[PDB]
């Protein structure tokens, strides 16, 4: 059948299965797969991507 991955889903970002810093994004039930390239990391708590503020060095 047709893919149901974003069907009925609310908007916002969802976690990716393989790459280091890409995400899934849902907009009006349509799926986008995009990257967060520079300093940006995905946060599962906000369904958003944000700049990393923690330096462990």
Detailed description of the structure:
The PDB classes it as sugar binding protein. The entry lists the keywords CBM, hevein like fold, chitin binding, chitotriosidase, sugar binding protein. The assembly is monomeric. With 57 residues, this protein is mostly beta strands. The chain has one domain (1-57). The protein contains no helices and 5 strands. It has strands at residues 12-15, 22-27, 30-35, 40-43, 48-51. The strands form 2 sheets. The chain has a 3-stranded antiparallel sheet with strand order 1-2-3, with no helix packed on it. Strand 2 (22-27) and strand 3 form a beta hairpin.
Explain the layout of strands and helices.
Elements: E1 12-15, E2 22-27, E3 30-35, E4 40-43, E5 48-51
Antiparallel strand pairs: 1-2, 2-3, 4-5
Could you provide a short overview of the structure?
With 57 residues, this protein is mainly β. The protein is built from no helices and five strands. It is classed as sugar binding protein.
């Amino acid at each position: 059948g047709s893919p149901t991955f974003c069907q009925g889903k609310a908007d916002g970002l969802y976690p990716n299965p393989r790459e280091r810093s890409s995400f899934y994004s849902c907009a009006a039930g349509r799926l986008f797969q995009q990257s967060c390239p520079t300093g940006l990391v995905f946060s599962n708590s906000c369904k958003c991507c944000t700049w990393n503020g923690l330096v462990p060095r």
